[PDB]
Amino acid sequence: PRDLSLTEIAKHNTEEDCWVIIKDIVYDLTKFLPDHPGGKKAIILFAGKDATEEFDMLHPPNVLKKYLTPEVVLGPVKK
């Protein structure tokens, strides 16, 4: 299908093509990378993976809503 399955998500695992799962929502962070105040590599480390725990422990609850636009919010993981 090429939808938001874990299999498909895992393929977006480079700086050039970087998806990250946070609370079962897929974000395309490729263009956000140079904009990230925590640097590119911290996110690239989690490219194609779930970053929920590390995100929750490193950021205030208000960050997601203040830094991202709808164009990078791809949707929920398909189980």
Q: Is 73 in the site for ligand HEM (CB under 6 A)?
A: no
Q: Is 37 in the site for ligand HEM (CB under 6 A)?
A: yes
Number of residues lying near ligand HEM (CB under 6 A): 18
Tokens 């996110």 identify what position? 43
Angle made by CA atoms 63, 68, 72, in degrees to the nearest 5: 140
Instruction: Please check whether residue 24 is in contact with residue 76, taking contact to mean a CB–CB distance below 8 angstroms.
Output: yes
Pick 11 or 23: Cβ nearer ligand HEM: 23
Q: Is 47 in the site for ligand HEM (CB under 6 A)?
A: no
Annotated binding-site residue numbers for heme b: 59
